[PDB]
Amino acid sequence: MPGSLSGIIIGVTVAAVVLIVAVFVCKSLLWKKVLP
């Protein structure tokens, strides 16, 4: 067990920033609006 515990906690930071991009593109897709 060298110190692999340092490796899992840095991976948690990367998971949060990518999820914010997924909801942002869905709004640009709905920004088309409805033309009556």
Added chain:
Amino acid sequence: MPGSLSGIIIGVTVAAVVLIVAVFVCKSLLWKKVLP
């Protein structure tokens, strides 16, 4: 010599798997009745 540079290799994998899920969500929100 503390730093645990070997730790980064598991972190890069996490960004790839979450991006594939966003493609399935685009199809779920497009599936809603039939357009004649």
Added chain:
Amino acid sequence: MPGSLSGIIIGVTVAAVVLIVAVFVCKSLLWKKVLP
């Protein structure tokens, strides 16, 4: 004894991930608007 700064560094990174799941499950409760 009245705190532990060591516990907090790992604690703040996971908190952001669980916070996104909290608003997402609350949105599922808006489905039940039709009786079988």
Added chain:
Amino acid sequence: MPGSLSGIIIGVTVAAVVLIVAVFVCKSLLWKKVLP
């Protein structure tokens, strides 16, 4: 010369937390009423 590698690693963990708070205040402007 003095480095700054200590600044970016602590910086990414706090950044994700403050970004989610920015979304809730933006909806205060979308608090517009609706007439059926």
Added chain:
Amino acid sequence: MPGSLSGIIIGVTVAAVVLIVAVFVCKSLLWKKVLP
């Protein structure tokens, strides 16, 4: 007792590359670029 349970962590990266070729061959069936 050297085990082999630790082996699964690196195994997750191999799952990402095989999914890219799988969706690409299935997409060609919706656009068969051949004239009769």
Added chain:
Amino acid sequence: MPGSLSGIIIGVTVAAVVLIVAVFVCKSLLWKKVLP
């Protein structure tokens, strides 16, 4: 040069993240549709 088989395995891990972003930017080039 005598072998160094330990060197090739990192190559498959990075291949996944660079390949998915590459096809996504190339799709935006088919957008166009602008009035003078």
